[PDB]
């Protein structure tokens, strides 16, 4: 049912994403956001997969969507910052990495992936 439908796209999309088939894994997690739309993981993995095929325009939106279902998902912010970085919205990516450190007061990705925003 509508619960197990959300795991089906998790396992099936994950087994594609870890195999390097990010494009195939997107179409999996897509079914779950349309079946449930309440787990922040489904949009977070679709965002990561889009970010692995340099679709930062699509991965910005799916990172935002994961933050709308959770609000406390520090990874969904760091992922959004990595999208907005290579999208040219570098200063918007900073506003996302500065958040990751509120939710994780030692995050090495939030210190490092943010340092790229500030460099020449």
């Amino acid at each position: 049912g509508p619960h197990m439908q959300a795991i089906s796209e998790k396992d099936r999309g994950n087994g594609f994403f870890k195999e390097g088939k990010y494009e195939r894994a997107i179409e999996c997690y897509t079914r779950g956001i349309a079946a449930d739309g309440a787990n922040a993981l489904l949009p977070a993995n679709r965002a990561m997969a889009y970010l692995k095929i340099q679709k930062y325009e699509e991965a910005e939106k799916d990172c935002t969507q994961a933050i709308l279902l959770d609000g406390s998902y520090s990874k969904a912010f760091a992922r959004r910052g990595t999208a907005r970085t290579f999208l040219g919205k570098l200063n918007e990516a900073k506003q996302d990495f500065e958040t990751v450190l509120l939710l994780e007061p030692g995050n090495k990705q939030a210190v490092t992936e943010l340092s790229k925003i500030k460099k020449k």
Binding site: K10, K18, R79, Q109
Partner: peptide
């Protein structure tokens, strides 16, 4: 590997 962002949940 660890509490990292590029791993899927």
């Amino acid at each position: 590997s660890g509490p990292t962002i590029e791993e899927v949940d």
